[PDB]
């Protein structure tokens, strides 16, 4: 068909005070609209994997070393396999931003490789570079270390910093990784218009919380 | 006198190595109780403070959302202690507490406490800004039941920070058995003293220097 934008959306709910009923609603909405995945904190991975056990096209995405990215690589790897043991098949980790700003590139790559190795053959890895804290050169350097580390994806924002995704950065990241890794726009994507703008700039996945209203804008653009 | 109760804290995502150095040298100069740093900086802070045993290396566990498994909270606690930490500040599973899932909240705290057993003090951040008045009391009660050494107001990343009413409520629950740490929103000396009068034993702040120079 004319591919629904729903298949590119990671239904996301990461608030610190999220309760079980809200995760239940989030997984049911994803089963309904056939979102690309749900994105929940690691404590809800087991519940989401059970709720979506008969929905293979809807992955269970969790976040690693989130949202500050300022823990050790060994912790990020342990959380990754722990999440995978609990039923997660996609992981969005946060780079060590301070190590990147200090140009300690070997540790930034070592940090990403720890998650990649822990996920090898079991989960898709997304690397959150947190564009709002990086200069232009650090945005490209982080994407390059993601490519060398073997990640599957680069991701703009955690949604817990000073900004979200912009079309200029999505173009910027798509230029670095090319066709080899996916590019995900996240943080601030509120409407169908924003999501389409990121897709046009090169995004292959959208992290959002208003995914129900975004897809409802897809069925409502052709309404009579 | 006030400096021995302040955890000189810097937990920003883009904190660089030179700012951890500045943080430790201020901690030695003013003899703060500890430096609170993200786990990536524990090994460096411990080496910069080896010749200053009176100041401890404090880090944050399952920070700041507290929405990860107890298994990794324990791994991160054991990992931090291996890197030279002697105090850990963990965040409760807020969603589990709101869901009245008190056995998971308790077990999540005991995971950190058992990892730190005999090696590090455990502070339990309850995040007062997202809790009802009863959930604050319940969280402090589970902290005492799990063997925590402290109860802490906020992560500094949610709704609000420490209030004198919240400190007095938490001090009333833990009594003298556990410390009570005021963190978030304390900028001057006046706020610091206002929390201590309410029953605070430790203060978590960014501007520990600005607080100490108010008395000096």
Swiss-Prot record, chain A:
Native organism: Halalkalibacterium halodurans (strain ATCC BAA-125 / DSM 18197 / FERM 7344 / JCM 9153 / C-125) (Bacillus halodurans)
Xref: InterPro entries: Aldolase_TIM, DeoC, DeoC/FbaB/LacD_aldolase, DeoC_typeI
Pathway the protein contributes to: Carbohydrate degradation; 2-deoxy-D-ribose 1-phosphate degradation; D-glyceraldehyde 3-phosphate and acetaldehyde from 2-deoxy-alpha-D-ribose 1-phosphate: step 2/2
Predominant location: cytoplasm
Name assigned to this protein: Deoxyribose-phosphate aldolase
Lineage of producing organism: Bacteria, Bacillati, Bacillota, Bacilli, Bacillales
UniProt record similarity statement: Belongs to the DeoC/FbaB aldolase family. DeoC type 1 subfamily.
GO BP field: 2-deoxyribose 1-phosphate catabolic process; carbohydrate catabolic process; deoxyribonucleotide catabolic process
Entry keyword set: Cytoplasm, Lyase, Schiff base
